[PDB]
Amino acid sequence: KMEELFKKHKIVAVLRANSVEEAKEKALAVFRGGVHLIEITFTVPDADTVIKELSFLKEKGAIIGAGTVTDKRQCKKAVESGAEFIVSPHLDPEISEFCKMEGVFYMPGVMTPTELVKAMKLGHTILKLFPGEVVGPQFVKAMKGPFPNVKFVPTGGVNDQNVCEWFKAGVLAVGVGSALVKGTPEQVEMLAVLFVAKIAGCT
Amino acid sequence: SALAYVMLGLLLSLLNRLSLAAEAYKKAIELDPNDALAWLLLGSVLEKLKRLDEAAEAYKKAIELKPNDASAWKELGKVLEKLGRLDEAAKAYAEAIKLDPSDAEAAKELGKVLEKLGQLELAERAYQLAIELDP
Question: What's the CATH code of the domain at A8?
Answer without folding.
Answer: 3.20.20.70
